[PDB]
Design a protein around this ligand. Structure first.
Ligand SMILES: [Zn+2]
Ligand SMILES: [Zn+2]
Ligand SMILES: [Zn+2]
Ligand SMILES: [Zn+2]
Ligand SMILES: [Zn+2]
Lengths: 79, 344, 322, 384, 183, 48, 116, 77
């Protein structure tokens, strides 16, 4: 249900930034699952890294570190 | 799995214990099985800190207890159906139509079906049964309608009415709109029940159970002085009987008397001036004692009852002014007009 | 006036209308000529004689005379189909209820198992002291000769499997000679393991009770800080004195011609409390950092001077007491 | 000018009012449990009883195990079909009784546990044997905490109550006593007992209950009985958080006026522990002294009484107040230091007998209770 | 579009019936001291002598007999609320006990006849009935309705069930409520 | 038939006159019937 | 005779118990294409996003606090991923003579992207 | 407001002092350590001192910031 927190108008805003002019209605709920599985990949690696530092808290450094692994580097948050 | 290992002559020798581990680890109210103790994850916040005589007299009772039987009465004295009923539009236990996606209550059918004496094989609805009856017969619908009209020659005008209701599924009776629109105060509830001006707007669960501890809809668990003050005027709600507002002082909150307003004329009343303990939060609208009754009983010296007429919309309500001023027997249903030195 | 309302209800309505006006409601009370049953109440309705005739086999003539079967009431009728309002409880009270719930779970299960152990060990010490030639046909009645017929069934159905509990109960009823000692041994093992888990849980329950209980018993104090922030303001303190003045002026025109020259009354029986508040204020002045030191010392002699000048306390007494 | 604000006097026994006390306890009552998430617990009965044995109170009283009621004896008040359903329903065959589940209100808020019939039989047998021992003169006070099911009615189960044992006890009392007064200090209204004896003048049912939007909703002050039972059902509506002094100054004048006006021959006292402070469902602010002062005051009249324990959903507080009330009936005041029982871990953190009241608002104003007691006293003028 | 001119007194009687059944949870006393046949027979015996036209007499008897047959065939289908269907069930079982089929003419009172009249235009609009038959049936129903106003004090009285046993409505039990609206 | 539920438009002075008229009627009919019963009882005691 | 239970209540009355100018469709859409393309702020309300991460990280490790900058890093990364995926989808749509992204258009994009 | 709040404490100071000083703990809780100590360690109990003076000292410590709000409330309660 925290997933349903990613609301429609928010997915519409992402589509607008993405240049989409008419969003199907069945897209909204497809974008959730795709979103989840992706976050569920970064955050997984974010935590492997976390439990390697024996740290219990995660860091933004570990987040961009997990992105570097996945492939999609993120500049602006360290490293 | 061969619990009792009997001998050749049938004598018992030895039994084998069944699977204790099948339900040895069922989750109890603690969240853990009774086999194990508390986990560290809940031991952290429960204990204050977590680091990584038998002189009982309760066994003497059985002996000191004497049975008691001295009473005077001793001895002897595919498609999924729907989640709502198709007749009353309400939830409950349904009898599901086989070749039809409609579901009916056990009491909503004609004749009503006992919940223990069910149909053995298949159950069709009245509309479905009429459909199989039409499809089984070679002649079309209008042929059977004409045959039913001609065979029932005793009644002609109701014959088309008699024919078409065998095909209609049974439904709960509801008043038509034109009986309900003539009374604007009368509303329809969520279940189709009666509702009128003497009924509160139902409080949502956000107000009853989703409120803070100190602040409750009951207005009895805390000192709330923002109830003696009118919201849209800022003045003090003066109680009608005592002619006072006992706001209290927050240093002596026991000096504050609870005050509520009438749900019709908004006349503020103390909870003690009219004898009441509740605030009337849900249910019917609370009526202050100053309002004239809509129903009274008087003694004949049997009895006689009088009920005030229901409110009627302006297109069908006639207000008439008497010519006779004194002694005009009105039914008790009146309207007050403004009074316009000689009369005094 | 339409011969509809009775004189009694008219007098009651005027009493609700002109109750505080004692002189007027008496004029009417008599101008009218009122001289001082079937009160059913709001929460009872009368059934017909068809619904009354329901067979109660144990009733004699006295029971049919003294028991009411026509007038009934229900919570749904008294709710007007709306519901009921439960009393709001603190989160500390809720976790106290959860601790009690877990306690009850453990104790209910352990004591039921212990009662079954006592019955089974009575059966076992009965069956040990007899030979084997009649031990084959020895049977046990339902209830195992105990005052309950279901407690041992509950214990067996819990300890063993769901489907195997019934057949173990039947084997105990038919052939207790082999089934009784193994059942007793398993019940005793389950008893001691449950009791060890109950002691380890009892430690946790006791520490949370010590952490929770006094906050749970505190109702007004749990919300006193936000209530004091909201209600010890300028608006509420003006509202109290203005409401008392409004009450006095409203009741002045009705009676009490010597209208009082005061609204609030404050009693100060103890004088040491002034020194205590002065010490608390001095402690706050010494602790705080948002005020400058000259402002701090001016605050000090302002408070001391106002207390010495308003009340009968002298400055020497204040200095020697603080 | 009826209600008087009086501070709560300390509880003092009367040495000239020694009563033969009969205690009815069946060791099995506690081995029954309504459910997993359910507030009503029969386990409160045996921790109350464990406090009786470990205080050495069994040397001043006689402990009896009442014979459990059969099917018919329950039908002295209830219908045959309701008792037949109660004696046959189990959690296993709940789907075999669905019409009767909604007919008799059994299945939700009154769940089906597999010792239901035995629990009801123990409760009804305890109440009826206490009344019978009162009838024959074998005892002056009959104590039975196994019952108290005052919400159960003729053909339904409500308020965690299935068998209205109090009606059975009052029925057994009526065979030897002309007038029986029922006093209900449970925070809920005694709707089953009042409804049972609504139309009779032989039983006066007095209930001191919270009346708001609270269960069971019945218990308005205007409910005074119909027919021959008019002005023979006193209802005392109370608001939240009534303390010991306020409850005493309400209870003692009303019960005193009933005593010198109705003049009963036997008294049934429902000692619901949910009137205590800190209850799961109750909303009053009574300490154990405040709860037991009603029992001590009704003991002073000398009328042969039947103390029957009802509600109470926090087990520790209701057990402690039942032990104190039981000790009060033997003309002793138990010391505020609990002896070692097998359930000693419940009564933390002080492990004393006292039940501490909460500091919540006593919103029962003197004017409201004055009006309530004035109308109650006015209705009691016709009971001579 | 088919319209019926029901007087507002009978409309208020129907609305009070809806109040008593759904809100106050009251069912009708069955069998009533005045049934539906009894009303469709007294109306026929009252307006039969009001005019001397034999075709009008045939039309009036036709309307009365058709209303009786329609009432019997449609009462179990769509003429009673969810609360009264339990009472209908017990009436059917009581009739089957003594081996006489249940006829709603001799059992149900005039309030259910008024319900049939009020719901009648929707039934008229749901069948392939020509304009002439619809108009004449509406006219006859309107004449019966304006006959009911002249006798509205003897068929639809106002009585508290808590005070009078001879009231048209009865209070219900909690067991009836549970079986009617719980399953 | 809209004429059956006609609401009477009444004024305050007419209500005042009707209330005064009916209380005076009730008071003097009970007073005169008490006087008649007293006279009848006096005649009964005289004749007896 | 098939039967089902929906009340889901063994007993009734559970509550009474003790326990005007208007633009054509698309013009406003293109206007706020321009608005959300010229802008750089973060489009998925934060709190809701943070929560998405708490309930989803819970699985990999309990009691895992997240530096604030981290949930801001997850947001940025997620919005960048979805705006790239949505540019591709619009293309996967404008391909099939259409102007409405549809689920299928994104199950494909991800297949060609190879992210599946 | 302050003087009324302190006067409520001082007017009952003698009885609460006599109650705290004459606090006879039960024996089986002392033998089996079932009684808490968190409030005695921190000298938050009120034994051996006058109750009102201890209230004043605890409130002074709370004002000075060396005492937590929760521990002050727990000691008072
Ligand atoms: Zn069908
Ligand atoms: Zn239905
Ligand atoms: Zn007032
Ligand atoms: Zn009002
Ligand atoms: Zn209760």
């Amino acid at each position: 249900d925290n997933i349903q927190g990613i609301t429609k108008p928010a997915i519409r805003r992402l589509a607008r930034r993405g240049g989409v002019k008419r969003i199907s209605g069945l897209i909204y709920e497809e974008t959730r699952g795709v979103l989840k599985v992706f976050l569920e990949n970064v955050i997984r690696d974010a935590v492997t890294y976390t439990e390697h530092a024996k740290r219990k808290t995660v860091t933004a450094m570990d987040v961009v570190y997990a992105l570097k692994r996945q492939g999609r580097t993120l500049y602006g948050f360290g490293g | 799995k061969e619990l009792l290992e009997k001998d050749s002559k049938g004598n018992i020798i030895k039994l084998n214990e069944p699977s204790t581990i099948s339900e040895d680890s069922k989750v109890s109210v603690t969240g853990l099985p009774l086999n194990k103790g508390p986990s560290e994850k809940i031991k952290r916040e429960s204990l204050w800190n977590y680091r990584k005589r038998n002189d009982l007299k309760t066994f003497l009772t059985e002996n000191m207890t004497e049975e008691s039987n001295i009473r005077s009465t001793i001895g002897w004295n595919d498609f999924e159906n729907e989640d709502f009923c198709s007749a009353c539009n309400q939830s409950g236990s349904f009898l599901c139509c086989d070749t039809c996606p409609k579901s009916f209550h056990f009491l909503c059918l004609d004749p009503p079906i006992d919940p223990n004496n069910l149909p053995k094989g298949d159950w069709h609805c009245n509309e479905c049964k009429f459909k199989i009856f039409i499809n089984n017969s070679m002649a079309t619908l209008k042929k059977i309608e004409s045959n039913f009209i001609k065979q029932n020659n005793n009644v002609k005008i109701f014959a088309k009415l008699l024919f078409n209701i065998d095909s209609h599924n049974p439904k709960q009776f509801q008043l038509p709109n034109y009986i309900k629109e003539t009374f604007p105060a009368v509303k329809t509830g969520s279940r189709g029940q009666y509702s009128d001006e003497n009924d509160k707007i139902p409080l949502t669960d956000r107000q009853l159970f989703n409120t803070s501890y100190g602040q409750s809809i009951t207005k009895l668990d805390s000192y709330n002085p923002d109830t003696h003050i009118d919201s849209n005027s800022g003045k003090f709600l003066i109680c009608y009987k005592c002619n006072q507002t006992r706001l209290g002082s927050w240093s002596h909150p026991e000096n504050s008397r609870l005050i509520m307003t009438c749900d019709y004329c908004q006349t503020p009343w103390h909870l003690d001036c009219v004898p009441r303990a509740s605030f009337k939060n849900l249910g019917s609208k609370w009526k202050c004692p100053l309002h004239s009754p809509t129903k009274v009983y008087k003694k004949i010296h049997n009895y006689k009852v009088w009920k005030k007429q229901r409110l009627i919309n302006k297109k069908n309500q006639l207000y008439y002014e008497p010519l006779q001023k004194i002694g005009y027997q009105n039914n008790g249903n009146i309207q007050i007009i403004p009074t316009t030195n000689s009369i005094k | 006036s339409q011969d509809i309302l009775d004189l009694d209800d008219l007098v009651e309505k005027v009493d609700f209308y002109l109750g505080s006006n004692k002189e007027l409601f008496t004029w009417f009370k008599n101008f009218v000529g009122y001289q001082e049953c079937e009160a059913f109440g709001p929460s009872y309705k009368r059934l017909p004689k068809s619904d009354t005739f329901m067979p109660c086999s144990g009733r004699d003539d006295m029971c049919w005379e003294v028991l009411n079967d026509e007038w009934v009431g229900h919570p749904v009728w008294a709710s007007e189909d709306s519901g009921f309002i439960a009393h709001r409880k603190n989160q500390y009270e809720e976790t106290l209820f959860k601790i009690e719930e877990e306690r009850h779970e453990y104790d209910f299960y352990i004591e039921s198992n212990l009662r079954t152990i006592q019955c089974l060990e009575t059966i076992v010490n009965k069956i040990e002291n007899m030979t084997e030639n009649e031990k084959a046909n020895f049977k046990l009645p339902p209830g195992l000769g105990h005052t309950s017929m279901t407690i041992y069934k509950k214990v067996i159905r819990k300890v063993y499997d769901k489907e195997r509990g019934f057949e173990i109960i039947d084997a105990l009823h038919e052939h207790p000679a082999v089934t009784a000692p193994v059942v007793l041994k398993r019940l005793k093992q389950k008893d001691e393991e449950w009791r060890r888990a109950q002691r380890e849980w009892n430690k946790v329950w006791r520490e949370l009770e010590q952490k929770v209980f006094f906050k749970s018993l505190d109702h007004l104090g749990l919300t006193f800080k936000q209530a004091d922030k909201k209600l010890l303001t300028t608006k509420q303190l003006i509202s109290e004195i203005s409401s008392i003045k409004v009450d006095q002026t409203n009741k002045k025109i009705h009676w009490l011609t010597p209208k009082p020259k005061s609204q609030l009354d404050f009693d100060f029986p103890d004088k040491n409390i002034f020194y205590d508040i002065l010490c608390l204020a001095d402690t706050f002045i010494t602790h705080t950092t948002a005020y400058s030191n000259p402002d701090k010392e001016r605050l000090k002699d302002l408070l001391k001077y106002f207390i010495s000048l308003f009340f009968s306390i002298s400055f020497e007494k204040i200095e020697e007491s603080l | 000018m009826v209600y008087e604000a009086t501070p709560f006097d300390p509880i003092t026994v009367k040495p000239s009012d020694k009563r033969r006390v009969a205690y009815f306890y069946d060791a099995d009552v506690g081995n029954y449990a309504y459910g997993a998430g359910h507030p009503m617990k029969p386990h409160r009965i045996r921790m109350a009883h464990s406090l009786i044995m470990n205080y050495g109170l069994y040397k001043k009283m006689e402990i009896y195990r009442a014979k459990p009621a059969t099917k018919q004896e329950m039908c002295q008040f209830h219908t045959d079909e309701y008792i037949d359903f109660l004696s046959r329903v189990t959690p296993d065959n709940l789907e075999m009784f669905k019409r009767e589940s909604v007919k008799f209100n059994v299945g939700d808020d009154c769940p089906v546990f597999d010792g239901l019939y035995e629990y009801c039989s123990i409760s009804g047998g305890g109440s009826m044997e206490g009344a019978a021992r009162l009838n024959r003169g074998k005892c002056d006070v009959a104590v039975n905490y196994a019952g108290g099911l005052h919400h159960a009615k003729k053909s339904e189960a409500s308020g965690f109550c299935y068998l209205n044992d109090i009606v059975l006890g009052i029925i057994e009392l009526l065979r030897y006593h002309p007038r029986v007064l029922y006093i209900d200090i449970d925070v809920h209204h005694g709707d089953g007992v009042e409804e049972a004896f609504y139309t009779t003048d032989r039983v006066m049912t007095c209930s001191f209950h919270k009346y708001g939007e609270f269960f069971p909703g019945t218990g308005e002050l205007r409910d005074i009985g119909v027919g021959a039972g008019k002005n023979y059902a006193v209802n005392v509506p109370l608001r939240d958080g009534i303390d010991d002094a306020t409850y005493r100054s309400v209870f003692e004048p009303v019960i005193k006026k009933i005593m010198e006006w109705y003049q009963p021959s036997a008294v049934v006292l429902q000692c619901g522990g949910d009137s205590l402070s800190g209850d799961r469902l109750g909303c009053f602010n009574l300490s154990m002294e405040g709860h037991a002062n009603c029992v001590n005051y009704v003991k002073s009249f000398g009328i042969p009484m039947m103390v029957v324990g009802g509600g109470g959903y926090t087990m520790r507080n209701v057990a402690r107040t039942w032990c104190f009330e039981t000790g009060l009936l033997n003309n002793v005041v138990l010391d505020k230091d609990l002896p070692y029982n097998e359930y000693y871990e419940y009564y933390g953190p002080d492990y004393k007998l006292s039940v501490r009241p909460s500091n919540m608002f006593n919103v029962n104003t003197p004017e409201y209770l004055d009006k309530v007691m004035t109308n109650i006293f006015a209705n009691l003028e016709n009971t001579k | 579009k088919i319209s019926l001119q029901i007087p507002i007194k009978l409309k208020s009687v129907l609305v009070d019936d809806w109040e008593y059944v759904t809100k106050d949870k009251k069912i009708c006393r069955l069998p009533a001291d005045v049934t539906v046949e009894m009303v469709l027979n007294k109306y026929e015996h009252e307006v039969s002598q009001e005019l001397e036209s034999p075709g009008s007499q045939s039309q009036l008897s036709e309307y009365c007999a058709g209303l009786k047959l329609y009432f019997d065939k449609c009462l179990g289908n769509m003429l009673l609320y969810r609360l009264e269907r339990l009472q209908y069930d017990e009436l059917l079982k009581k009739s089957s006990k003594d081996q006489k089929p249940l006829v709603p003419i001799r059992i149900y009172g005039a309030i259910h006849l008024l319900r049939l009249i009020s719901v009648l235009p929707e039934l008229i609009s749901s069948t392939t009935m020509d304009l002439q038959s619809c108009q004449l049936l509406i006219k006859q129903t309107e004449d019966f309705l304006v006959w009911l106003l002249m006798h509205v004090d003897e068929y639809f009285n106002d009585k508290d069930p808590n005070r009078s046993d001879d009231a048209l409505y009865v209070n219900t039990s909690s067991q009836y409520e549970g079986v009617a609206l719980g399953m | 038939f809209n004429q059956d539920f006609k609401i009477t438009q009444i004024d305050e002075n007419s209500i005042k006159y009707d209330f005064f008229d009916k209380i005076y009627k009730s008071k003097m009919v009970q007073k005169r019937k008490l006087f008649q019963f007293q006279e009848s009882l006096i005649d009964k005691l005289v004749s007896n | 005779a098939r039967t089902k239970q929906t009340a889901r209540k063994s007993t009734g009355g559970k509550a009474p118990r003790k326990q005007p100018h208007r633009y054509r469709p698309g013009t406003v859409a293109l206007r706020e294409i321009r608005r959300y393309q010229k802008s750089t702020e973060l489009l998925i309300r934060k709190l809701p996003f943070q929560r998405l991460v708490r309930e989803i990280a819970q699985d990999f490790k309990t009691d895992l606090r997240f530096q604030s900058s981290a949930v801001m890093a997850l947001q940025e990364a997620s919005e960048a991923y979805l705006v790239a995926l949505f540019e591709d989808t619009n293309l996967a749509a404008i391909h099939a003579k259409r102007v409405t992204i549809m689920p299928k258009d994104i199950q494909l994009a991800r297949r060609i992207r190879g992210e599946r | 407001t302050i003087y009324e709040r302190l006067l409520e404490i001082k007017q009952m100071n003698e009885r609460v002092t006599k109650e705290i000083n004459t606090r006879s703990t039960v024996t089986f809780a002392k033998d089996l350590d079932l009684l808490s100590s968190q409030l005695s360690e921190m000298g938050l109990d009120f034994v051996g001192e006058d109750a009102y003076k201890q209230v004043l000292r605890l409130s002074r410590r709370l004002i000075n910031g060396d005492l937590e709000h929760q521990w002050f409330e727990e000691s008072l309660r």
